[PDB]
Design a protein around this ligand. Structure first.
Ligand SMILES: [Fe+3]
Ligand SMILES: [Fe+3]
Ligand SMILES: [Fe+3]
Ligand SMILES: [Fe+3]
Lengths: 322, 491, 83, 322, 491, 83
């Protein structure tokens, strides 16, 4: 008879006793058990073909993607603990700054900058939410999928902050069109057309490794540097302490996403040929990210400097990954 | 001060825009989105009845896990599992093996809708659904993990869906068809409306009650916590169905609901039916599986369908009839073929249980009871070897379950065979065969365990070879839950 | 060597039963009986086991051999008690 | 035989089913059972005399002080829930503003104002902690005692924030003497002598009703208006966004204390003669509170206006109670 | 970034200053502060070993209550209390009645130190202590409140300490002397060092283990949660004692420790001893009360005292001896006078229990067993009326407990009487009388229940009048826990 | 009417027993016995119950009356088996 083990059979012989993270996160996708027929149905269905083409046939290769480990080791339980603390902070800021009358003290000129450069970000953050939830469903290992799960939740969190503040702004300045105008700004304003082109194209990159590169390695650092870093700094200097703080709070999530993205690239570099595969995708997407930063930041106050700093900070993210 | 949710909630789902740098069909591929020629504008009519925002979500769900993990840690050294009724132990082993990794795969099915639904309220509710199934897959691993040192059968909480054991194949067959290989709108209908709203929402209420009745407060607290998450995401198919009906697609919608409810029923008849009528100790049986189905499932379906403008599936009357039969067959099949599962099936045919069965199902003793008579005589007369099989049952090519039905004095076992492109397929019901015929390219070249055996894929091509192919070895192979203790009533 | 599916009278389940293309219906019923009689179905020695094609209800004579029956592999056959 | 009740015998016949607050808070002091011998020992012990003189013989009178109910209905469980949310907020501010480099951006002149007017408040807040924990132990009803319990915890919370920030300031500006000099400032600086005289005298007012008036009705609104309101406003205008926010966060506790203080005065006014008893104590203590506000606020920037506003805001607290 | 606690912690207790507008003796009255001529500067040497800051406190304690209240809510409908061993039910009723309002009064004893201690680290730790006892008093009301509809005896969780029932008087006598009527420094020593560190810290560990063993996971989770709070505040007397010893006050310190440990012991001998040796079912008895005392209490005291530079109390050897005796008397007294308590005492003298008692205490059957022999014969022979009393026992004027000791073949019951200013006092031990003589003005004019009876204060002056004076009526008056089921073993 | 405390031989507890100032020691022992013999102590009819002052061990003669014993109210008395 088979004797009881101390841990799951797939973790037996790990020396050190498995963490909660390993116990609940590892080796959970079963579609990868049978690469010739991922799903338990006829092998020629559109979804079987989708997964063979975009998961199994990706040029980004590893023989054991299940070995991947999130450096933050997030699980659902620890995600909600962490983010309930961070939301107590943000929701306190919202509550106490409204108290306060913070929005009433912003200048007319800044209020107009918010309508153009801040509130339309509900589209861009939702497009990131969609981007990362696509990575979720096509990644080849449950531990890679879970990083994308919690990142998706974060992008929804950013959308939600932006939705809330947009209402608070509309209440304070009902003549500006906060809440009503953002779609037309996102669709028609030159400042947003670099980003919108970038994210619309990135959203149809179906190969899991390309999706990861386009969204996490290229688009996100450009979005985060333009919209959190440069706009947040500008907010602070313009008297908008709420947005200055909000953007820094959101950047903590962005730093987390970069940490797992960096761990994954690290793992990919264990195999010959992967760096070149990643550098080629970076070289395809990088020029659209430039266009994005250029169009958005050039339109801000002290625009040219914003462009230069957004560009090197985002390139630096990839540089530090090799 | 804070705003009221209702004042800003809509801005969270004002997220659709008109793509320019790519086309709409490129951004939302029809095989993934299933928008069915209904415009982006008409999908935006989607309005989920239960609303929740990120801050509320993380706060409520933090408290849920604080509670459930607290209960678990408090009760852990008590070792209840070591003195639990062995039919209860087997109920848990079955539950975890069948469900933990399918809960986790459901987060991918939610991710499908989150990316590909044209209804922005659906994309956000599916992001919360994706989180919820993440929770469910994880907590339903963390909980059984406590027991790995008690029995290798607890390893199957993780291992099962990675095997070709027949119940695993039957589970992937169901989930892969309902939720993993369908477009976003079909997933909202087949998974969230038909299966989650339709079956598991009430099933889990029942199961938590049974657990508490068995004295298992850890598992009762687990299941009851998971259950409170269900409606937040199970609500997603109702709105999709409304849009299909209001636009030109009521027949498409009817057909998805018909397929999904039938396949759900088949899974339920093997995973839940036997548990209620045979594994749960007699004095703990609140109602029969048939009674549970009529009170808590069937009526609710008719109500939902009426309100949506849909019809009762064509097979409804037959389905009602099968409440007297199907699960008795799935139980007898599982007990008879017990070394082929990873839990110990409870026979459940003592004199006292048999009179309970006779009240709940008049006719039982003279149909089902006949086979059980023979089995009981062999065990009384020292021929246990005639109570385990030496062949494979015929497996349905839709649900991947044995074709079984009323035996004994009202014998009514039928096979709804089909010859299609030179292959002969077998089906356990008229509805099963119909699910195939309405979409044969979805199932055509799939082979069940029997098909594989006959094709040469299971080697050595014998029962021992079949067990190894299914990853089963002594220590996990099932046997009678009560170690044949009930035989002593017959001598 | 030829696979059939046995739907044995008064049993609850259809089962896979390999038979031989040279078997008579009588010898097929024997092979089937092995997986049902005294398992789950009581003997009926006042009766004779017959073979009929499940799909259309065609009764095969006792002496007819599998080779001549026009069966599809895996065809379902009822095995019924007659006199 | 006595039949089981639906609630505690002392709450039986309340119409509406008792709240958790009532179940765990009411009618818990047993020293009041025997006013001639409060404690279960010889009746002439110093503590028996202390309680007869300072609890039982107080001129502030009511026949059922156990009827008192905290308007916020706090219990230990709900106190910790509330304050863990508020501390997630404050600790986030501390964490994110340090990140940030907030302290590095304050002017030399403001840094010196902090050393004089902010950090020595660790003494004053601890003196309030002592004040309110004395009310705890001499109040005549458990529901009055519990309001003082949670208020004591709040004053400890304010001391703790001040201790933390004092260290952070000393790290940023090690030449200023943050952490080292506050005792000498509290003991010797004219700006603090009004407050120190007020609180030292108030700390020896042993009659429960006088202690309540001196600490909660007189001293606290003066402390809160000078140190939270006026200094916090000044901080904000001087670039110190942390202290601006910290003081507003602390004021939320102060508003809670005023709410229960107001409920208690309300209850006291049900009995003839109590208003006059309370007005006489207010008239004794009010001039020392004036001295306090005068000395502290006159020394601040735009000092004379601070005095006028601190004075009317604190008087207004008492005015709104009758 | 955040600082490390250690970098700023001291500033939280840098809070002493030199008063100017009032004097130091006015601000810290000696009857409240107990600084004993030791300077403010020397009290500032006080350094608590376990450190905690407000933010940590609220966060950890929020999680504690989330857990404990979660366990309670999960297990509530299970109604365990209705099928619990009745000695277990009685253990809980006794626990709650004796302790809930004394926990709450302990927050006042902590408030005493918070206001009046000259050591600033003591004032802050006492503010956290004041909070902790607030929790304890509240949660130990919320929990039994669940049961008020089961029995009026559960009302006594709130009512008991408001009555003149003799065990209530004995509890207030103890708590009022140790913690409510002493200066801050004496409270730190008598309450936190001698009683909390010395007894309840380990008692609660034991009690939570017993609860779990009884199948009571709600009460196990309650007690185990409360226990984790204890050391945060129980630590406060150790530092006070160090300062007294290092300054000129070792004898004063020794005398407070001697009194406090003796009074604690007496309370423990009646509230805990009988529970372990007689109410807990035999098969659940891990060790004897004497064994528990030697392993977990007595050794730890000697260790603490040695390390502090103090001596074993003068009565230590006698105390060791009394571990064989005192609680057997308190049990027999409580069972014999059972209508005078609000729980049902468990006799605990079956043949099986009596052989357990004989092993744990050689000599039991021929001393204690003698009285129990007579009682058992009367119950066997239908004279139950001779198993309840028709008079009051003599009550000790220190501990307010019956004067009782070894009966039967080694009869050794003694009264350590004292005539003082024209009154005759009675004492159950040499130590009890000594606690009086070292401080007679603290106890002189107190009257125990017997004193009151004899003075005319209990009217009607008869047993029925005494019951009414004690607020006891049928429905709460105690009787045998097992309804004399154990008598059937003797016929 | 006079309160004493009875410490009865072989009992485990001292008890309050009202006696009369006119009682003999014999009648005091009777009054005490009522609360101990057949309660908790077995009879000893080969023996005579005597009264001694607990504090100093002074034996009172059987016929001596309470009035003459020089007792303090509530004095403890041992009630012992003798011959
Ligand atoms: Fe789920
Ligand atoms: Fe679900
Ligand atoms: Fe406590
Ligand atoms: Fe304590």
């Amino acid at each position: 008879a088979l004797k009881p083990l101390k841990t799951w059979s797939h973790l037996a012989g790990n020396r050190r006793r498995p963490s909660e993270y390993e116990v609940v996160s590892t080796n959970l996708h079963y579609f990868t058990d049978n690469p010739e027929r991922p799903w338990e149905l006829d092998s020629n269905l559109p979804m079987q073909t989708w997964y063979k083409k975009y998961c199994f046939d990706s040029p980004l290769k590893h023989d054991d993607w299940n070995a991947f480990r999130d450096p933050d080791q997030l699980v659902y339980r620890t995600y909600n603990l962490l983010q309930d603390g961070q939301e107590s902070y943000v929701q306190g800021l919202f509550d106490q700054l409204n108290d306060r009358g913070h929005d009433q003290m912003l200048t007319r000129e800044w209020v107009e900058t918010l309508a153009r450069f801040y509130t339309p970000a509900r589209y861009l953050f939702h497009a990131l939410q969609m981007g990362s939830v696509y990575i979720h469903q096509i990644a080849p290992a449950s531990t890679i999928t879970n990083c994308a799960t919690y990142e998706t939740a974060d992008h929804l969190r950013w959308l939600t902050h932006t939705a809330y503040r947009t209402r608070e702004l509309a209440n304070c300045y009902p003549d500006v069109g906060f809440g009503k105008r953002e779609r037309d700004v996102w669709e028609n304003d030159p400042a947003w057309q670099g980003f919108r082109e970038l994210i619309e194209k990135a959203l149809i990159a179906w190969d899991w490794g390309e999706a990861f590169t386009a969204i996490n390695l290229v688009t996100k650092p450009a979005v985060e540097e333009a919209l959190l870093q440069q706009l947040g700094s500008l907010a602070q200097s313009e008297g908008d302490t709420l947005l200055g703080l909000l953007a820094q709070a959101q950047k903590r999530d962005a730093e987390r996403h970069r940490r797992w993205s960096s761990a994954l690239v690290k793992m990919a570099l264990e195999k010959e040929g992967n760096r070149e595969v990643l550098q080629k995708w970076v070289a395809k997407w990088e020029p659209l990210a430039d266009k994005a930063i250029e169009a958005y930041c050039s339109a801000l106050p002290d625009g040219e400097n914003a462009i230069v700093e957004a560009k090197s900070a985002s390139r630096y993210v990839r540089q530090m990954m090799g | 001060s804070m705003l009221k949710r209702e004042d800003w909630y809509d801005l969270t789902r004002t997220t659709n825009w008109t793509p320019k740098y790519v086309t709409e069909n490129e951004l939302f591929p029809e095989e993934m989105s299933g928008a069915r020629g209904i415009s982006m504008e008409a999908w935006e009519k989607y309005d989920e009845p239960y609303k929740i925002t990120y801050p509320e979500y993380v706060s409520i769900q933090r408290e849920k896990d604080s509670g459930a993990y607290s209960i678990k840690a408090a009760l852990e050294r008590d070792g209840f599992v070591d003195r639990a009724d062995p039919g209860w132990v087997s109920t848990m082993q079955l539950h975890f093996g069948a469900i933990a990794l399918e809960e986790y795969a459901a987060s991918t099915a939610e991710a499908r809708m989150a990316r590909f639904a044209k209804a922005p309220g659906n994309r956000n509710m599916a992001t919360f659904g994706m989180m919820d199934e993440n929770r469910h897959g994880q907590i339903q691993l963390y909980f059984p993990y406590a027991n790995v040192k008690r029995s290798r059968k607890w390893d199957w909480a993780h291992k099962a869906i990675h095997t070709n054991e027949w119940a695993a194949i039957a589970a992937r067959s169901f989930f892969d068809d309902m939720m993993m290989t369908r477009d976003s709108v079909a997933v909202s209908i087949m998974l969230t409306f038909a299966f989650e709203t339709g079956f598991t929402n009430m099933q889990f209420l029942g199961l938590a009650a049974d657990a508490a009745e068995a004295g298992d407060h850890t598992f009762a607290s687990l299941i009851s916590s998971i259950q409170t998450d269900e409606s937040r995401h199970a609500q997603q198919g109702g709105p999709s169905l409304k849009i299909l009906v209001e636009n030109g697609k009521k027949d498409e919608a009817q057909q998805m609901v018909d397929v999904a409810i039938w396949r759900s029923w088949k899974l339920f008849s093997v995973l839940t039916g036997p548990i209620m009528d045979y594994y749960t100790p007699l004095e703990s049986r609140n109602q029969s599986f048939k009674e549970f189905m009529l009170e808590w499932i069937v009526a609710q379906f008719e109500r939902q369908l009426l309100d949506l403008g849909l019809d009762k599936p064509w097979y409804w009357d037959q389905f009602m009839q099968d409440l007297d039969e199907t699960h008795h067959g799935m139980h007898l099949g599982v007990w008879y073929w017990r070394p082929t599962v990873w839990w110990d099936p409870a026979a459940g045919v003592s004199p006292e249980e048999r009179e309970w069965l006779e009240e709940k199902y008049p006719g039982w003793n003279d149909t089902w009871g006949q086979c059980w008579d023979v089995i009981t005589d062999n065990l009384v007369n020292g021929k246990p070897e005639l109570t385990v099989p030496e062949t494979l049952p015929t497996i349905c090519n839709m649900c991947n379950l044995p074709i079984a039905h009323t035996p004994g004095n009202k014998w009514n076992v039928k096979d709804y065979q089909l010859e299609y492109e030179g292959r002969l397929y077998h089906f356990g019901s008229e509805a099963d065969r119909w699910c195939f015929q309405i979409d044969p390219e979805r199932y055509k070249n799939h082979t069940n365990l029997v098909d594989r055996f006959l094709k040469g894929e299971i080697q050595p091509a014998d029962l021992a070879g079949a067990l190894m192919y299914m990853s089963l070895e002594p220590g996990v192979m099932g046997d009678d839950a009560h170690d044949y203790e009930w035989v002593k009533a017959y001598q | 060597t030829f696979p059939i599916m046995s739907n044995f009278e008064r049993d609850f389940v259809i089962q896979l039963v390999p038979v031989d293309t040279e078997d008579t219906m009588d010898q097929v019923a024997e092979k089937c009986a092995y997986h049902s009689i005294n398992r789950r179905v009581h003997p009926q020695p006042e009766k004779i086991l017959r073979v009929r094609r499940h799909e259309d209800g065609t009764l095969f004579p006792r002496g007819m051999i599998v080779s001549d029956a026009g069966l599809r592999p895996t065809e379902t056959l009822d095995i019924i008690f007659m006199d």
